[PDB]
Amino acid sequence: ARHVFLTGPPGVGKTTLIHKASEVLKSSGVPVDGFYTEEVRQGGRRIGFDVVTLSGTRGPLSRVGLEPPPGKRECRVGQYVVDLTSFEQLALPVLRNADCSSGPGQRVCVIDEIGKMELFSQLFIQAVRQTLSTPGTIILGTIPVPKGKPLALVEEIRNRKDVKVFNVTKENRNHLLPDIVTCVQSSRK
């Protein structure tokens, strides 16, 4: 079978249909890997983001800080300042831990959120193409829709065409989980 990407408008929910997909392959004995950001809300206020891994590790990602002055480069998204190293802490090996054997096993690689970072995106382009090099690993992720300008990281995947493109709605939002798994497990069990 082939890679699968979500698309549509942002509005939060698809995140958890991927999370459910990250229980189900597991319940089918397919040890999925990769990372997912979650909304770091210490007692319910947005203070930054993290980068969880399916191994239960979670990174920094962004935290509160001043905007970058016109001399000192930093990576502000609105209020918080991200860092590429905050990803590299964990969102770097998880793309492609090991290789050998081939045949039965394959791999699955979760990458929710490939859309916000389209300017800061640096090690993404690299690490993601090392993942797309692997024949076993099954890219599974969330890009935005193409409207106007090409996102300078979604381009690296857009290249393929072959990836399934699941346009979510807010209507049938919670339906898409099995519809993705259908495409994934279309690889010979």
Coordinates of N, CA, C and O in Angstrom, one line a residue:
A1 N 0.9 -1.2 0.0 CA 0.0 0.0 0.0 C 0.9 1.2 0.0 O 2.0 1.2 -0.5
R2 N 0.4 2.4 0.4 CA 1.1 3.7 0.4 C 0.8 4.6 1.6 O -0.1 4.3 2.4
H3 N 1.6 5.7 1.6 CA 1.4 6.7 2.6 C 0.0 7.3 2.6 O -0.6 7.4 1.5
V4 N -0.4 7.9 3.7 CA -1.7 8.5 3.9 C -1.5 9.9 4.6 O -0.8 9.9 5.6
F5 N -2.1 10.9 4.1 CA -2.1 12.3 4.7 C -3.6 12.8 4.8 O -4.4 12.6 3.9
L6 N -3.8 13.4 6.0 CA -5.0 14.2 6.3 C -4.8 15.5 5.6 O -3.7 16.0 5.4
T7 N -6.0 16.2 5.3 CA -6.0 17.5 4.8 C -7.4 18.1 5.2 O -8.2 17.4 5.8
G8 N -7.6 19.4 5.0 CA -8.8 20.1 5.3 C -8.5 21.4 5.9 O -7.4 21.9 5.7
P9 N -9.5 22.1 6.5 CA -9.3 23.2 7.4 C -8.8 22.8 8.8 O -9.3 21.8 9.3
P10 N -7.9 23.6 9.4 CA -7.7 23.4 10.9 C -8.9 23.7 11.7 O -9.8 24.5 11.2
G11 N -9.0 23.1 12.8 CA -10.2 23.3 13.7 C -10.2 22.2 14.8 O -11.2 22.2 15.6
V12 N -9.2 21.4 14.9 CA -8.9 20.4 16.0 C -10.0 19.3 16.0 O -11.2 19.5 16.3
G13 N -9.5 18.1 15.8 CA -10.2 16.9 16.1 C -9.5 15.7 15.4 O -9.3 14.6 16.0
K14 N -9.1 15.9 14.1 CA -8.4 14.9 13.3 C -7.2 14.3 14.1 O -6.8 13.2 13.9
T15 N -6.6 15.1 14.9 CA -5.5 14.9 15.9 C -5.7 13.5 16.6 O -4.9 12.7 16.6
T16 N -7.0 13.4 17.1 CA -7.4 12.3 17.9 C -7.8 11.1 17.1 O -7.7 10.0 17.5
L17 N -8.2 11.3 15.8 CA -8.5 10.2 14.9 C -7.1 9.5 14.6 O -7.1 8.3 14.5
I18 N -6.1 10.3 14.4 CA -4.7 9.7 14.3 C -4.4 9.0 15.6 O -3.9 7.9 15.5
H19 N -4.6 9.7 16.8 CA -4.3 9.0 18.0 C -4.9 7.6 18.1 O -4.3 6.7 18.5
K20 N -6.2 7.5 17.8 CA -6.9 6.3 17.8 C -6.3 5.3 16.8 O -6.1 4.1 17.1
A21 N -5.9 5.8 15.6 CA -5.1 5.0 14.7 C -3.8 4.5 15.3 O -3.3 3.5 14.8
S22 N -3.3 5.2 16.3 CA -2.0 4.8 17.0 C -2.3 3.9 18.2 O -1.5 3.8 19.1
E23 N -3.5 3.4 18.3 CA -3.9 2.3 19.3 C -4.3 1.0 18.6 O -4.2 -0.1 19.1
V24 N -4.6 1.1 17.3 CA -5.3 0.1 16.6 C -4.4 -0.8 15.8 O -4.5 -2.0 15.9
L25 N -3.4 -0.2 15.1 CA -2.3 -1.0 14.6 C -1.7 -1.6 15.8 O -1.2 -2.8 15.7
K26 N -1.6 -1.0 17.0 CA -1.0 -1.6 18.1 C -1.7 -2.8 18.6 O -1.1 -3.8 18.9
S27 N -3.1 -2.7 18.6 CA -3.9 -3.8 18.9 C -3.9 -4.9 17.8 O -4.3 -6.1 18.1
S28 N -3.4 -4.6 16.6 CA -3.1 -5.5 15.5 C -1.7 -5.9 15.5 O -1.2 -6.6 14.6
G29 N -0.9 -5.5 16.5 CA 0.5 -6.0 16.7 C 1.5 -5.3 15.8 O 2.6 -5.9 15.5
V30 N 1.2 -4.2 15.2 CA 2.0 -3.3 14.3 C 2.5 -2.2 15.2 O 1.7 -1.2 15.5
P31 N 3.7 -2.2 15.7 CA 4.3 -1.2 16.6 C 4.6 0.1 15.8 O 5.7 0.3 15.3
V32 N 3.6 1.0 15.7 CA 3.7 2.3 15.2 C 4.8 3.1 16.0 O 5.0 2.9 17.2
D33 N 5.3 4.1 15.3 CA 6.3 5.0 15.9 C 6.1 6.5 15.4 O 5.3 6.7 14.5
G34 N 6.9 7.4 15.9 CA 6.9 8.8 15.5 C 6.6 9.7 16.7 O 6.9 9.4 17.8
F35 N 6.0 10.9 16.4 CA 5.7 11.9 17.4 C 4.4 12.6 17.1 O 3.9 12.6 15.9
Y36 N 3.8 13.3 18.1 CA 2.7 14.1 18.0 C 2.9 15.3 19.0 O 3.3 15.0 20.1
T37 N 2.6 16.5 18.6 CA 2.6 17.6 19.5 C 1.3 17.6 20.3 O 0.3 17.2 19.7
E38 N 1.2 18.0 21.6 CA 0.0 18.2 22.3 C 0.0 19.6 22.9 O 1.0 20.3 23.0
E39 N -1.2 20.1 23.2 CA -1.5 21.4 23.6 C -1.1 21.6 25.1 O -2.0 21.2 25.9
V40 N 0.1 22.0 25.4 CA 0.6 22.1 26.7 C -0.2 23.2 27.5 O 0.0 24.4 27.3
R41 N -1.1 22.7 28.3 CA -2.0 23.5 29.1 C -1.8 23.2 30.6 O -2.6 22.4 31.1
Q42 N -0.8 23.8 31.2 CA -0.7 23.6 32.7 C -2.0 24.1 33.3 O -2.2 25.3 33.3
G43 N -2.8 23.2 33.9 CA -4.1 23.5 34.5 C -4.9 24.4 33.6 O -5.6 25.3 34.0
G44 N -4.9 24.2 32.2 CA -5.8 24.9 31.3 C -5.4 26.3 31.0 O -6.3 27.2 30.9
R45 N -4.2 26.7 30.8 CA -3.8 27.9 30.0 C -2.7 27.5 29.0 O -1.8 26.8 29.4
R46 N -2.8 28.0 27.8 CA -1.9 27.7 26.7 C -0.5 28.4 27.1 O -0.5 29.6 27.1
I47 N 0.5 27.6 27.4 CA 1.8 28.1 27.8 C 2.9 27.8 26.8 O 4.0 28.4 26.9
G48 N 2.6 26.9 25.8 CA 3.6 26.4 24.9 C 3.0 25.2 24.2 O 1.9 24.9 24.4
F49 N 3.9 24.4 23.5 CA 3.6 23.1 23.0 C 4.7 22.1 23.5 O 5.7 22.6 24.0
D50 N 4.4 20.8 23.3 CA 5.5 19.8 23.5 C 5.6 19.0 22.2 O 5.0 19.3 21.2
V51 N 6.5 18.0 22.2 CA 6.5 16.9 21.2 C 6.5 15.6 21.9 O 7.5 15.1 22.3
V52 N 5.3 15.0 22.0 CA 5.2 13.6 22.6 C 5.7 12.6 21.5 O 5.7 12.9 20.3
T53 N 6.3 11.5 21.9 CA 6.7 10.4 21.1 C 5.8 9.2 21.5 O 5.4 9.2 22.6
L54 N 5.5 8.3 20.6 CA 4.7 7.1 20.9 C 5.4 6.2 22.0 O 4.8 5.3 22.5
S55 N 6.7 6.5 22.4 CA 7.5 5.9 23.4 C 7.2 6.6 24.8 O 7.9 6.3 25.8
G56 N 6.3 7.6 24.8 CA 5.9 8.3 26.1 C 6.9 9.4 26.5 O 6.7 9.9 27.6
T57 N 8.0 9.7 25.8 CA 8.8 10.8 26.0 C 8.1 12.0 25.4 O 7.4 11.9 24.4
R58 N 8.3 13.2 25.9 CA 7.8 14.4 25.3 C 8.8 15.6 25.5 O 9.4 15.8 26.5
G59 N 9.0 16.4 24.4 CA 10.0 17.4 24.3 C 9.5 18.7 24.9 O 8.3 18.9 25.2
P60 N 10.4 19.7 24.9 CA 10.0 21.1 24.7 C 9.5 21.2 23.2 O 9.8 20.4 22.4
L61 N 8.9 22.4 22.9 CA 8.7 22.8 21.5 C 8.8 24.3 21.5 O 9.9 24.8 21.1
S62 N 7.8 25.0 22.1 CA 7.8 26.4 22.2 C 7.5 26.8 23.7 O 6.9 26.0 24.4
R63 N 7.8 28.0 24.1 CA 7.5 28.6 25.4 C 7.4 30.1 25.2 O 7.7 30.6 24.1
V64 N 6.9 30.8 26.2 CA 6.7 32.2 26.2 C 8.1 32.9 26.0 O 9.1 32.3 26.4
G65 N 8.1 34.1 25.4 CA 9.3 34.9 25.1 C 8.9 36.1 24.3 O 7.8 36.2 23.8
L66 N 9.8 37.1 24.3 CA 9.7 38.3 23.5 C 9.7 37.9 22.0 O 10.2 36.9 21.7
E67 N 9.2 38.8 21.2 CA 9.4 38.7 19.7 C 10.8 38.9 19.4 O 11.6 39.6 20.1
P68 N 11.3 38.3 18.3 CA 12.7 38.5 17.8 C 12.9 39.9 17.3 O 12.1 40.4 16.5
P69 N 13.8 40.6 17.9 CA 14.1 42.0 17.3 C 14.7 41.8 15.9 O 15.2 40.7 15.6
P70 N 14.8 42.8 15.1 CA 15.1 42.7 13.7 C 16.6 42.3 13.5 O 17.0 41.9 12.4
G71 N 17.4 42.3 14.5 CA 18.8 41.8 14.5 C 19.0 40.4 15.0 O 19.8 39.7 14.4
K72 N 18.3 39.9 16.0 CA 18.5 38.6 16.6 C 17.4 37.7 16.1 O 16.2 37.9 16.4
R73 N 17.8 36.7 15.3 CA 16.8 35.7 14.8 C 16.3 34.9 15.9 O 17.1 34.3 16.7
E74 N 15.0 34.6 16.0 CA 14.3 33.6 16.8 C 13.0 33.3 16.0 O 12.7 33.9 15.0
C75 N 12.2 32.3 16.5 CA 11.2 31.7 15.7 C 9.8 31.8 16.4 O 9.3 30.8 17.0
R76 N 9.2 33.0 16.4 CA 8.0 33.3 17.1 C 6.8 32.8 16.2 O 6.9 33.1 15.0
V77 N 5.8 32.2 16.7 CA 4.6 31.7 15.9 C 3.4 32.7 16.1 O 2.6 32.8 15.2
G78 N 3.3 33.4 17.2 CA 2.3 34.3 17.5 C 2.8 35.0 18.8 O 3.3 36.1 18.7
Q79 N 2.7 34.3 19.9 CA 3.4 34.7 21.2 C 4.6 33.8 21.5 O 5.7 34.4 21.7
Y80 N 4.5 32.5 21.5 CA 5.6 31.6 21.9 C 6.7 31.7 20.8 O 6.4 32.0 19.7
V81 N 7.9 31.2 21.2 CA 9.0 31.1 20.4 C 9.3 29.6 20.4 O 9.5 29.0 21.4
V82 N 9.3 29.0 19.2 CA 9.7 27.6 19.0 C 11.2 27.5 18.9 O 11.9 28.5 18.9
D83 N 11.8 26.3 18.9 CA 13.1 26.0 18.5 C 13.2 24.7 17.7 O 12.5 23.8 18.1
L84 N 14.1 24.6 16.7 CA 14.3 23.4 15.9 C 14.9 22.3 16.7 O 14.6 21.1 16.6
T85 N 15.8 22.7 17.7 CA 16.4 21.8 18.6 C 15.3 21.1 19.5 O 15.4 20.0 19.9
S86 N 14.2 21.9 19.9 CA 13.2 21.3 20.7 C 12.5 20.1 20.1 O 12.2 19.1 20.8
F87 N 12.4 20.1 18.7 CA 12.1 19.0 17.9 C 13.2 17.9 18.0 O 12.9 16.8 18.4
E88 N 14.4 18.3 17.6 CA 15.5 17.4 17.4 C 15.8 16.5 18.6 O 16.3 15.4 18.5
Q89 N 15.4 16.9 19.8 CA 15.5 16.2 21.1 C 14.9 14.8 21.0 O 15.4 13.9 21.7
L90 N 13.8 14.6 20.2 CA 13.1 13.3 20.1 C 12.6 13.1 18.7 O 12.6 12.0 18.2
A91 N 12.1 14.1 18.0 CA 11.5 14.1 16.7 C 12.5 14.0 15.6 O 12.5 14.6 14.5
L92 N 13.6 13.1 15.8 CA 14.7 13.0 14.9 C 15.1 11.5 14.7 O 15.1 11.0 13.6
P93 N 15.3 10.7 15.8 CA 15.4 9.3 15.7 C 14.1 8.6 15.4 O 14.1 7.7 14.6
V94 N 13.0 9.1 15.9 CA 11.7 8.4 15.8 C 11.2 8.3 14.3 O 10.4 7.4 14.0
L95 N 11.7 9.1 13.4 CA 11.5 9.0 12.0 C 12.0 7.6 11.5 O 11.3 6.9 10.7
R96 N 13.2 7.2 11.9 CA 13.9 6.0 11.3 C 14.8 5.4 12.3 O 16.0 5.5 12.2
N97 N 14.2 4.8 13.3 CA 14.9 3.9 14.2 C 15.2 2.6 13.5 O 14.2 1.9 13.1
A98 N 16.5 2.2 13.3 CA 17.0 1.0 12.7 C 16.5 0.7 11.3 O 15.7 1.5 10.7
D99 N 17.0 -0.3 10.6 CA 16.5 -1.0 9.5 C 17.2 -2.4 9.5 O 18.4 -2.4 10.0
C100 N 16.6 -3.4 9.0 CA 17.2 -4.7 8.5 C 16.0 -5.5 8.0 O 14.9 -5.0 7.9
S101 N 16.3 -6.8 7.6 CA 15.3 -7.8 7.5 C 14.4 -7.7 6.3 O 14.5 -8.5 5.3
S102 N 13.5 -6.7 6.2 CA 12.5 -6.5 5.2 C 11.5 -7.7 5.2 O 11.6 -8.6 6.1
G103 N 10.5 -7.7 4.3 CA 9.5 -8.7 4.3 C 8.4 -8.3 5.3 O 7.9 -7.2 5.3
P104 N 8.0 -9.3 6.2 CA 7.0 -9.0 7.2 C 7.5 -8.0 8.2 O 8.7 -8.1 8.7
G105 N 6.7 -7.0 8.6 CA 6.9 -6.1 9.6 C 6.5 -4.7 9.1 O 5.5 -4.1 9.7
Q106 N 7.1 -4.2 8.0 CA 7.0 -2.9 7.6 C 7.3 -1.9 8.8 O 8.1 -2.3 9.7
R107 N 6.9 -0.7 8.8 CA 6.9 0.2 9.9 C 5.8 1.3 9.7 O 5.3 1.4 8.5
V108 N 5.4 2.0 10.7 CA 4.5 3.2 10.5 C 5.1 4.4 11.2 O 5.7 4.2 12.3
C109 N 5.1 5.5 10.6 CA 5.6 6.8 11.1 C 4.6 7.8 11.2 O 4.1 8.4 10.1
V110 N 4.2 8.2 12.4 CA 3.2 9.3 12.7 C 4.0 10.6 12.6 O 5.0 10.7 13.3
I111 N 3.4 11.6 11.9 CA 3.8 13.0 12.0 C 2.5 13.8 11.8 O 2.1 14.2 10.7
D112 N 1.8 14.0 12.9 CA 0.8 15.1 12.9 C 1.5 16.5 12.9 O 2.6 16.6 13.2
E113 N 0.7 17.5 12.4 CA 1.2 18.8 12.1 C 2.4 18.9 11.3 O 3.6 18.9 11.7
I114 N 2.2 19.0 9.9 CA 3.2 19.4 8.9 C 2.5 20.5 8.2 O 2.0 20.4 7.1
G115 N 2.5 21.7 8.8 CA 1.8 22.9 8.2 C 2.1 24.2 8.8 O 2.4 25.2 8.1
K116 N 2.1 24.3 10.1 CA 2.5 25.5 10.9 C 4.0 25.8 10.7 O 4.4 26.9 10.6
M117 N 4.8 24.7 10.6 CA 6.3 24.9 10.6 C 6.8 25.3 9.2 O 8.0 25.5 9.2
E118 N 6.0 25.5 8.2 CA 6.4 25.6 6.8 C 7.5 26.7 6.4 O 7.9 26.8 5.3
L119 N 8.0 27.5 7.4 CA 9.0 28.5 7.3 C 10.2 28.1 8.2 O 11.3 28.2 7.7
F120 N 10.0 27.7 9.4 CA 11.0 27.3 10.3 C 11.5 25.9 10.0 O 12.6 25.5 10.4
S121 N 10.8 25.1 9.2 CA 11.0 23.7 8.8 C 12.4 23.6 8.2 O 12.7 24.2 7.1
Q122 N 13.3 22.9 8.8 CA 14.7 22.8 8.5 C 15.1 21.3 8.4 O 15.3 20.7 7.4
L123 N 15.1 20.7 9.6 CA 15.5 19.3 9.8 C 14.4 18.4 9.3 O 14.6 17.2 9.0
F124 N 13.1 18.9 9.3 CA 12.0 18.2 8.8 C 12.3 17.7 7.4 O 12.4 16.5 7.2
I125 N 12.4 18.6 6.3 CA 12.8 18.2 5.0 C 13.8 17.1 4.9 O 13.6 16.1 4.1
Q126 N 14.9 17.1 5.7 CA 15.9 16.0 5.7 C 15.3 14.8 6.3 O 15.3 13.7 5.6
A127 N 14.9 14.8 7.6 CA 14.5 13.6 8.3 C 13.3 12.9 7.7 O 13.3 11.7 7.5
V128 N 12.3 13.7 7.2 CA 11.2 13.2 6.5 C 11.6 12.5 5.2 O 11.2 11.4 4.9
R129 N 12.6 13.1 4.4 CA 13.0 12.3 3.2 C 13.8 11.1 3.6 O 13.7 10.1 2.8
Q130 N 14.6 11.0 4.7 CA 15.1 9.8 5.1 C 14.0 8.7 5.4 O 14.2 7.6 5.1
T131 N 12.9 9.2 6.0 CA 11.8 8.3 6.2 C 11.1 7.9 4.9 O 10.9 6.7 4.8
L132 N 10.9 8.8 4.0 CA 10.3 8.5 2.7 C 11.3 7.6 1.8 O 10.8 6.9 0.9
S133 N 12.6 7.5 2.2 CA 13.5 6.6 1.6 C 13.2 5.2 2.0 O 13.4 4.3 1.2
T134 N 12.8 5.0 3.3 CA 12.6 3.7 3.8 C 11.4 3.0 3.1 O 10.4 3.7 2.9
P135 N 11.5 1.7 2.7 CA 10.4 1.0 2.1 C 9.5 0.5 3.1 O 8.3 0.3 2.8
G136 N 9.9 0.2 4.4 CA 9.1 -0.3 5.4 C 8.1 0.7 6.0 O 6.9 0.5 6.0
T137 N 8.7 1.9 6.4 CA 7.9 2.9 7.1 C 6.8 3.5 6.3 O 6.9 3.7 5.1
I138 N 5.7 3.8 7.0 CA 4.4 4.1 6.4 C 4.1 5.5 6.9 O 3.7 5.6 8.1
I139 N 4.4 6.5 6.1 CA 4.1 7.9 6.5 C 2.6 8.1 6.7 O 1.8 7.7 5.9
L140 N 2.3 8.7 7.8 CA 0.9 8.9 8.3 C 0.9 10.3 9.0 O 1.6 10.4 10.0
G141 N 0.2 11.3 8.5 CA 0.4 12.6 9.0 C -0.7 13.6 8.6 O -1.6 13.3 7.8
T142 N -0.6 14.8 9.1 CA -1.5 15.9 8.9 C -0.9 17.1 8.2 O -0.3 18.0 8.9
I143 N -1.1 17.3 6.9 CA -0.8 18.5 6.2 C -2.0 19.4 6.0 O -3.1 18.9 6.2
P144 N -1.9 20.7 5.7 CA -3.0 21.6 5.4 C -3.5 21.3 4.0 O -3.0 20.4 3.3
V145 N -4.5 22.0 3.5 CA -4.9 22.0 2.1 C -3.9 22.9 1.3 O -3.4 23.9 1.8
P146 N -3.7 22.6 0.0 CA -3.1 23.4 -0.9 C -4.1 24.5 -1.3 O -5.1 24.3 -2.0
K147 N -3.8 25.8 -0.9 CA -4.4 27.0 -1.4 C -3.3 28.0 -1.5 O -2.7 28.3 -0.5
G148 N -3.1 28.5 -2.7 CA -2.0 29.4 -2.9 C -0.7 28.8 -2.6 O -0.3 27.8 -3.2
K149 N 0.2 29.5 -1.8 CA 1.6 29.3 -1.8 C 1.9 27.9 -1.3 O 1.3 27.4 -0.3
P150 N 2.9 27.2 -2.0 CA 3.4 25.9 -1.5 C 4.1 26.0 -0.2 O 5.0 26.9 -0.1
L151 N 3.7 25.2 0.8 CA 4.4 25.1 2.1 C 5.7 24.4 1.8 O 5.7 23.3 1.3
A152 N 6.8 25.0 2.2 CA 8.2 24.6 1.9 C 8.7 23.3 2.6 O 9.9 23.1 2.7
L153 N 7.8 22.6 3.2 CA 8.0 21.3 3.8 C 6.9 20.3 3.2 O 7.2 19.1 2.9
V154 N 5.7 20.7 3.1 CA 4.7 19.9 2.4 C 5.1 19.6 1.0 O 4.7 18.5 0.5
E155 N 5.9 20.4 0.4 CA 6.4 20.2 -1.0 C 7.1 18.9 -1.1 O 6.9 18.2 -2.1
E156 N 7.9 18.5 -0.1 CA 8.8 17.3 -0.1 C 7.9 16.0 -0.2 O 8.3 15.0 -0.7
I157 N 6.7 16.1 0.4 CA 5.7 15.0 0.3 C 4.8 15.2 -0.9 O 4.5 14.2 -1.6
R158 N 4.4 16.4 -1.3 CA 3.5 16.8 -2.4 C 4.1 16.2 -3.7 O 3.3 15.6 -4.4
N159 N 5.4 16.2 -3.8 CA 6.2 15.5 -4.8 C 5.6 14.1 -5.2 O 5.6 13.8 -6.3
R160 N 5.2 13.3 -4.2 CA 4.9 11.9 -4.4 C 3.7 11.7 -5.2 O 3.7 10.8 -6.0
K161 N 2.6 12.6 -5.0 CA 1.2 12.4 -5.5 C 0.6 11.1 -5.0 O -0.6 11.1 -4.6
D162 N 1.3 10.0 -4.9 CA 0.8 8.6 -4.5 C 0.1 8.6 -3.2 O -0.6 7.6 -2.9
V163 N 0.4 9.5 -2.3 CA -0.1 9.5 -0.9 C -1.7 9.6 -1.0 O -2.2 10.4 -1.8
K164 N -2.4 8.9 -0.2 CA -3.8 9.1 0.0 C -4.0 10.4 0.6 O -3.3 10.8 1.5
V165 N -5.1 11.2 0.2 CA -5.4 12.5 0.7 C -6.8 12.5 1.3 O -7.8 12.5 0.5
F166 N -6.9 12.4 2.6 CA -8.1 12.4 3.4 C -8.5 13.8 3.8 O -8.1 14.3 4.8
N167 N -9.4 14.4 3.0 CA -10.1 15.7 3.4 C -11.0 15.4 4.5 O -12.1 14.9 4.3
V168 N -10.7 15.8 5.7 CA -11.6 15.8 6.8 C -12.7 16.8 6.6 O -12.5 17.8 5.9
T169 N -13.8 16.7 7.3 CA -14.8 17.7 7.6 C -14.9 17.8 9.1 O -14.4 17.0 9.8
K170 N -15.6 18.8 9.6 CA -16.2 18.8 10.9 C -17.5 18.0 11.0 O -18.1 17.8 12.1
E171 N -18.1 17.6 9.9 CA -19.3 16.9 9.8 C -19.0 15.4 10.2 O -19.2 15.0 11.3
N172 N -18.4 14.7 9.3 CA -18.0 13.3 9.5 C -16.6 13.2 10.1 O -15.8 12.3 9.8
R173 N -16.3 14.1 11.0 CA -14.9 14.3 11.5 C -14.4 12.9 12.1 O -13.4 12.4 11.7
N174 N -15.2 12.4 13.0 CA -14.9 11.2 13.7 C -15.0 9.9 12.9 O -14.8 8.8 13.4
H175 N -15.4 10.0 11.6 CA -15.4 8.8 10.7 C -14.1 8.5 10.1 O -14.0 7.4 9.6
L176 N -13.2 9.4 10.1 CA -12.0 9.2 9.2 C -11.0 8.2 9.7 O -10.3 7.6 9.0
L177 N -11.0 8.0 11.0 CA -10.0 7.1 11.7 C -10.0 5.7 10.9 O -9.0 5.4 10.3
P178 N -11.1 4.9 10.8 CA -11.1 3.7 10.2 C -10.8 3.8 8.7 O -10.3 2.8 8.1
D179 N -11.2 4.9 8.0 CA -11.0 5.1 6.6 C -9.5 5.2 6.3 O -9.1 4.7 5.2
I180 N -8.7 5.8 7.2 CA -7.3 5.8 7.1 C -6.8 4.4 7.3 O -6.0 3.9 6.5
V181 N -7.2 3.7 8.4 CA -6.7 2.3 8.7 C -6.9 1.4 7.6 O -6.1 0.6 7.2
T182 N -8.1 1.6 6.8 CA -8.4 0.8 5.7 C -7.3 0.9 4.6 O -6.9 -0.1 4.0
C183 N -6.8 2.1 4.4 CA -5.7 2.3 3.4 C -4.4 1.8 3.9 O -3.7 1.1 3.2
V184 N -4.1 1.9 5.2 CA -2.9 1.4 5.9 C -2.8 -0.1 5.8 O -1.9 -0.7 5.1
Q185 N -3.8 -0.8 6.3 CA -3.9 -2.3 6.4 C -4.2 -2.9 5.0 O -4.1 -4.2 4.9
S186 N -4.4 -2.1 4.0 CA -4.4 -2.6 2.6 C -3.0 -3.1 2.2 O -2.9 -3.9 1.3
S187 N -1.9 -2.8 2.9 CA -0.7 -3.5 2.8 C -0.9 -4.9 3.4 O -1.4 -5.0 4.6
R188 N -0.6 -6.0 2.7 CA -0.9 -7.4 3.0 C -0.6 -7.7 4.5 O 0.5 -7.6 5.0
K189 N -1.7 -7.9 5.3 CA -1.7 -8.6 6.5 C -1.7 -10.0 6.0 O -2.8 -10.5 5.5

